[PDB]
Design a protein around this ligand. Structure first.
Ligand code: HEM
Ligand SMILES: OC[C@H]1O[C@@](CO)(O[C@H]2O[C@H](CO)[C@@H](O)[C@H](O)[C@H]2O)[C@@H](O)[C@@H]1O
Ligand SMILES: CC[C@@H]1C(=O)OC[C@@H]1Cc1cncn1C
Length: 464
């Protein structure tokens, strides 16, 4: 027997039970009705949804290997079963393991992630000053910071903030994440063959993915022509070197195409989610100026107005720590996670879950638990503050997921969020164009991601 769920119709399945523009809300509605594990058909693809901390944790932690597969995502068919993110094949385990180890090597030491982020803060602060306290759209300014950070690890390359190629890549990342959060792409994701050769915004996503891949492909090729296996320059070099070291084996983990997919995965994933979180963070703080003020107080007391922020500052800045945690919790940036897949026939809570079934370990339902976070729908730093006014740790903080497919750059992202928000607020006050009271924090699109409203602001200097 399958987990309980709604009776499906011919062709469309349970499409009437879903609001295309807010799938996460529909999951939640279905959870009250059927419980923390339920079956759904969207089209002819059967899925099982986990909802709530217990179900999600059990799925990812007690059934590690059973649900460690990756569900298909037609828009990213040019990556399927290659690289990391969209890899449901036999190369996933080893490519992931090697990529994690390599990322850790580049993150460790005095030339590590902290220093890399600190250097990049210089350019970020420079760009913010150059706005002269005039209105500007933050989207493609602040996004440069994580984009350059991951580019350094991948290509040992640094872009000027208005390099045309650089802006184009970020534009593509932004459009994709945006469009992948819209009702049309949600329909396409589930009915790809009915919809693919019709007109629609799905074509742009597909075109955009191919364009990022092509750019990464050329970079991989330029690295292969000028390689020195004794002195690795970046992550692509390490992957290229690993490819030569297996040239006489039976089965191959590394293709030139496998590597560009792997690196385009990291490039896209290393840029877009960090950029969106920061951008969403700035909007949030502008709605709550008293929160911005307390942060300004903590920075000036602990770090002072001049010294560059460092990761260990987190340990002496409980309010910033709580705020950075609360931004990630409140926005539920990837609210349905990435789709998992059953690797074999599995019995979960006495329910049959057949091989190939899509498994959805819902994240918003963990981030919005009303027992762990009383008033979950509200932005409150005190969701992460104890009695002593100190940081209050929570296991329900899972915006990166958990288990075998846990976000490959969790540590990078968290250090970026802390250091860069610290840097920004050390040197600037945030000025909204509209009154704080009229700021709407609701996402404008909800799908693969949660998309912030478009806005402009001024940043007014603190330092001179
Ligand atoms: C706020 C920033 C970020 C968020 C919210 C986020 C979130 C996530 C989530 C929810 C998943 C799916 C986990 C699962 O399937 O169980 C994921 C996967 C992944 N992320 Fe992130 N991530 C962020 C930053 C990053 C960064 C900086 C990188 C690269 C350095 C990155 C690379 C990846 C990769 C390669 C995967 C696929 C893992 C796999 O399939 O085995 N992410 N991320
Ligand atoms: O169809 C799903 C979803 O797509 C939207 C736009 O997001 O409309 C698309 O599909 C309609 C067919 O149902 C077309 O008439 C329209 O041209 C196309 O944009 C939403 O209206 C709809 O919910
Ligand atoms: C389709 C892939 C998903 C997406 O678009 O945004 C989140 C997820 C890819 C991802 C994983 N970690 C960071 N990102 C950007």
């Amino acid at each position: 027997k399958l987990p309980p769920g709604p009776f499906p119709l011919p062709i469309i399945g349970n499409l009437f039970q879903l609001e295309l523009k807010n799938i996460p809300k529909s999951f939640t509605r279905l959870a009250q009705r059927f419980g923390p594990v339920f079956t759904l058909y969207v089209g002819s693809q059967r899925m099982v949804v986990m909802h709530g901390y217990k179900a999600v944790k059990e799925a990812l932690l007690d059934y590690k290997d059973e649900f460690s597969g990756r569900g298909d995502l037609p828009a990213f068919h040019a990556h399927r079963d290659r690289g990391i993110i969209f890899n449901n094949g036999p190369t996933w385990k080893d490519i992931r393991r090697f990529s994690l180890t390599t990322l850790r090597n580049y993150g460790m030491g005095k030339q590590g992630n902290e220093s890399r982020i600190q250097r990049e803060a210089h350019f970020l602060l420079e760009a913010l000053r150059k706005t002269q306290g005039q209105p500007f759209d933050p989207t493609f300014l602040i996004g440069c910071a994580p984009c350059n950070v991951i580019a350094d690890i991948l290509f040992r390359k640094h872009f000027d903030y208005n390099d045309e190629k650089f802006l184009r890549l970020m534009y593509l990342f932004n459009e994709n994440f945006h469009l992948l959060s819209t009702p049309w792409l949600q329909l396409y994701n589930n009915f790809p063959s009915f919809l693919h050769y019709l007109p629609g915004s799905h074509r742009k996503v597909i075109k955009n993915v191919a364009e990022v891949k092509e750019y990464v492909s050329e970079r991989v090729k330029e690295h292969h022509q000028s390689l020195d296996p004794n002195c690795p320059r970046d992550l692509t070099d390490c992957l290229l070197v690993e490819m030569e070291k297996e040239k006489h084996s039976a089965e191959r983990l590394y293709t030139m195409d496998g590597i560009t997919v792997t690196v385009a995965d990291l490039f896209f994933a290393g840029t877009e989610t960090t950029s969106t979180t920061l951008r969403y963070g700035l909007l949030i703080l502008m709605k709550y100026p008293e929160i911005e003020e307390k942060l300004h107080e903590e920075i000036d007391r602990v770090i002072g107005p001049s010294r560059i922020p460092a990761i260990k500052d987190r340990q002496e800045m409980p309010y910033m720590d709580a705020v950075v945690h609360e931004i990630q919790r409140f926005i539920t940036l990837v609210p349905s996670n990435l789709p998992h897949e059953a690797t074999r026939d599995t019995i979960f809570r006495g329910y049959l879950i057949p091989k190939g079934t899509v498994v959805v370990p819902t994240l918003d339902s963990v981030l919005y638990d009303n027992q762990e976070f009383p008033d979950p729908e509200k932005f409150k730093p005190e969701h992460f503050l104890n009695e002593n006014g100190k940081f209050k740790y929570s296991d329900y903080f899972k915006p990166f997921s958990t288990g075998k497919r846990v976000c490959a750059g969790e540590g990078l992202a968290r250090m970026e969020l802390f250091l860069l928000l610290c840097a920004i607020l050390q040197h600037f006050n945030l000025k909204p164009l509209v009154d704080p009271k009229d700021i709407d924090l609701s996402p404008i699109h909800i799908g693969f991601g949660c998309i912030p409203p478009r806005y402009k602001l001024c940043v007014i200097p603190r330092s001179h």
